[PDB]
Amino acid sequence: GPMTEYKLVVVGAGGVGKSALTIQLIQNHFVDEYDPTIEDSYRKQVVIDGETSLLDILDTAGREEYSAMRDQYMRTGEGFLLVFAINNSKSFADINLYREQIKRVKDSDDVPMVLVGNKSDLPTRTVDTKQAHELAKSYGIPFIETSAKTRQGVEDAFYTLVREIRQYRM
């Protein structure tokens, strides 16, 4: 097949590591600073399961004052990475509100989505793996624990989302 564009959207509460995960996938660099996002775009040609693919990534705002931009990016977005931080239990509750809003504006029960539990490198957590696996299990979506700091699970999270989109297209 030809190299197609896949429109990935990274969503989640402020400071969960949406930008750090995208930057790690794009160029293998960990950003220690917190540079709050409004709305960034990334484009990169990668090979997934032997197929050349063009990743178009929208790295969105977690800050609540930018909430009005959500309806436009949710309509245009094709697949969604739902990111929460494993040491932030409010971000885990917020990730369920993103999941619901995506289904409302897109009017579909099966929009391609991957639940991502970020900051797995931290010595302690406030959201246990069983809680997150239980939530993704009820919605029939994959769940991957990641660390933008060590790169653990980063490629897996974005590539699993591409695979979810591939099945949804059919």
Binding site: Q27, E39, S41, Y42, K44
Partner: peptide, 15 residues
């Protein structure tokens, strides 16, 4: 390539 909010053009980030 990367385009920050408010930028007119894309810049290289994968070189």
């Amino acid at each position: 390539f990367y385009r920050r909010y408010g930028w007119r053009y894309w810049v290289s980030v994968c070189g």
